[PDB]
Amino acid sequence: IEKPMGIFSILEEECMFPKATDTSFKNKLYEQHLGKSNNFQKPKPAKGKVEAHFSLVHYAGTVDYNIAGWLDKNKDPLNETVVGLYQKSSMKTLAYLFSKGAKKKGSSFQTVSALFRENLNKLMTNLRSTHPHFVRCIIPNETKTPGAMEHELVLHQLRCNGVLEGIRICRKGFPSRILYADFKQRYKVLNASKKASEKLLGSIDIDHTQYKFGHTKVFFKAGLLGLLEEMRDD
Amino acid sequence: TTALVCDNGSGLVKAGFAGDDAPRAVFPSIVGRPRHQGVMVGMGQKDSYVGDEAQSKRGILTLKYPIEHGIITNWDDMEKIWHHTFYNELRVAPEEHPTLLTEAPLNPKANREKMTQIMFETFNVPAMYVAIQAVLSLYASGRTTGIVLDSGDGVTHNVPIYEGYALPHAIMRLDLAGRDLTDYLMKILTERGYSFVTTAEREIVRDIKEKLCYVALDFENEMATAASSSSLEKSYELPDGQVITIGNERFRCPETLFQPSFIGMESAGIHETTYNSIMKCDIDIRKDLYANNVMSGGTTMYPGIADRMQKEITALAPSTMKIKIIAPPERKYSVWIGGSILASLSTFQQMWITKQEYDEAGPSIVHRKCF
Amino acid sequence: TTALVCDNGSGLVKAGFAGDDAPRAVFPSIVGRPRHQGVMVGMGQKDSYVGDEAQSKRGILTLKYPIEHGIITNWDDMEKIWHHTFYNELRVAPEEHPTLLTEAPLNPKANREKMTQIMFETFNVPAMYVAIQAVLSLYASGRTTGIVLDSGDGVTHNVPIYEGYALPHAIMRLDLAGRDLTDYLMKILTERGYSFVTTAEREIVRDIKEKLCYVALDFENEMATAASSSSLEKSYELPDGQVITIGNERFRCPETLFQPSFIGMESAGIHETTYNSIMKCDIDIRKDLYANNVMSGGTTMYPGIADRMQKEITALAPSTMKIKIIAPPERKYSVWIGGSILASLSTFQQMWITKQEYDEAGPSIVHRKCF
Ligand SMILES: Nc1ncnc2c1ncn2[C@@H]1O[C@H](COP(=O)(O)OP(=O)(O)O)[C@@H](O)[C@H]1O
Ligand SMILES: Nc1ncnc2c1ncn2[C@@H]1O[C@H](COP(=O)(O)OP(=O)(O)O)[C@@H](O)[C@H]1O
């Protein structure tokens, strides 16, 4: 979306080109990306929806976009003599419009996506200069009946918040970092500290691939304690 | 990073940054050298001015355009021009800026080659490219079809383009342009008693031409009119007073473009070569070309040229074809504008000629599709 | 589910859905490719237009009919034609649609073989079938007996049918059709001074033929008349003005169909081949055939062709049989109409070639009575 020859760049090109049209934009997009990438892909005609034109995949699943109107919605050539008029007006409008050559575009090359990608990076840097924390206020139910919830709707809030992506990235590694406090007392039922952990692990039939006790806690994939859950009880 | 767009032409160098809206720096592409000896020691007179500085020092210099008809004849003065452009007009190290160069069609290949070579050796740019002035002029007009009639100061060419395809066999170059009109005006201004012979006062004559001249919708009627009345005379003050007056000349001079016989050339007039270039194209695309006569370059900036042009080419063409003439009000810079537009593209960022590539393949690379 | 009816033919692809009343999509079966180089970057010019797109871009392309005389010679362009038809003209996934294809009689066996193979591999249809254009054109006419004289753009054939039985030993195919008439008109238009040589302007000539030409009831009388008077001259405006006028040519051109010697062919005329095809059939069925001459194909759409045809074949036949000529006003689409009719049937829904069957028996299944 952001690199050169990306979607935004191509949209800018078509906002510059003499006689560009929505069909030319769609073509240029396809010929520049289709097949030559994986995220970008063709829309699927189904579901009675009017028109999709290209499908992207994000951390929150796939989504296909409609292209009609993107050209004349993005071009915004800011006039200059009228801005001078504003600067010289007698109201307080001039308070807004108060008055290098490299990387500055012309008053005829202006485009919305550019200002977006500019202030977006302004954020993504000044926010990158600050320690983060996160809160995800869900709405679990259509109406105001507390305690009761439906999954599909909170499933949507799951992806829009993408916390499932966090649990996935922490999910393909060692999610379970646990001490001996419960490990010894729950696993001594098969072979009735560190060397005691080695004894209690070699004896309950686990291979040395899907776990690791580094020096303080033992690290575990998720699906292995369930294997023990039913077996570490007898 | 930013790309540079230097449109040389004759008469006027115009440069700027890709993506801008107008060339930042514009100055006459001349090199002057003193022709007296100078007597004030400590004045530290330099040995060769250039650009507006020479244009101001005219009185004691001898000016020499290093581009004659689209082609470069004195390479050292051209290098001085480029160096002055980069280091004073734009004040930018050309080390990290792909530059876009322009040239007329049907030029000596050695011109373009030596241009590339100097660009890569002397100034050591990261990349470069040479484009055809007419294509850029079409870009600037937001078209994609239509013959374009560029007419700068040294050359005049028609390029018919359709759907972005150029028909090269129908390109018509003609070596009649602003410099020739200036000379013819210098000539016919004698018959009133005014004598301008110095390379300096050729500039005076050029100013007179840019201010007073204009194309006449009907040559014979205007001639008879200027004969009868005197409502056409206009005065003009020279750099030392002594106002002068020109009458018939005002439209005699630019009339040449339609009757080149005035200066002894045999080729056909502007309208005629335009119509011929049309007729050489395939029959299925002639209506659009009739409808989209773009016009650029400073010589197409005469009051009335578009109307006379339309009348003539209408007289030549059939009657059921619509004749239109796209003459924007800023057309003098259409080449540079289109150049900035093109250079600012991203689908263009893979057409440049990389320094490494040129080192690999030598200046013969230009003619290759690294065009 | 719905079935497709794609009548390829030369010159004109006409497709649509079974059961409809007229083909939805109709466009020239040509594939154009640019022949200049193109200079405006970012135009994203595709490399091969097709159909009406190419017919509009004619001025800068080189058009190639991929079907010479009923037979497919360039399979890649034919595949482009089919793909464009399905995915843009009808906008339908061919995955779930049995398609009906047509071809002339006495064609190369490999033609229909490779056709079936491509239809099953590339497009992966569920089923398909290949029918004889003349049988369909008879279906559309609501007949069950009568010689059908289909004369498309590439080929011309007679098929005598009686009670729904075909007499293959009397099928007479002749390789003179609209394309040859177009070429002959291009030739004889020179003798007036008009010169069309480009594949683009062959289309202009085709339009002239479709508009102005007509068949003369008596060739000699019309020749002498055009000599004497000028009441036959008609004008025509080319795509760039410069109106032209044609006289004698208007009926000189389509007269070829009755005197193939004009283009240096040795075979007999249309009327005579028809009469011969009649005479090759059994004597008991000749009267019905005399009464039921059917005409299809765009080439049989000349003003006056039915009257001249009747006169000639009456002169050849005895004076006690009755000669009639069934020339509907929409006969140009009779093949597609008959195809839709036949595909709509249910007694036909077991004649298709199921993809499973082809996978089981290979493309040789076509000639096999799974026809
Ligand atoms: N207003 C004007 N009227 C007539 N001629 C003009 C006018 N302005 C400029 N010119 C002529 O046009 C020339 C400049 O054209 P230009 O497009 O700069 O040429 P080039 O493309 O070779 O640089 C000047 O030499 C001048 O003689
Ligand atoms: N009105 C007309 N008058 C004369 N000829 C015509 C007319 N319309 C079409 N044709 C000719 O008939 C041809 C189209 O016939 P068609 O039945 O489409 O052939 P095919 O069956 O091979 O596609 C065109 O090539 C054209 O030259």
From TrEMBL, chain A:
It is found in: Cytoplasm, Myofibril. Residues 120-142 are annotated as: Actin-binding. Belongs to the TRAFAC class myosin-kinesin ATPase superfamily. Myosin family. Muscle contraction. This is Uncharacterized protein. The chain holds residues 528 to 787 of 1943 of the full protein.
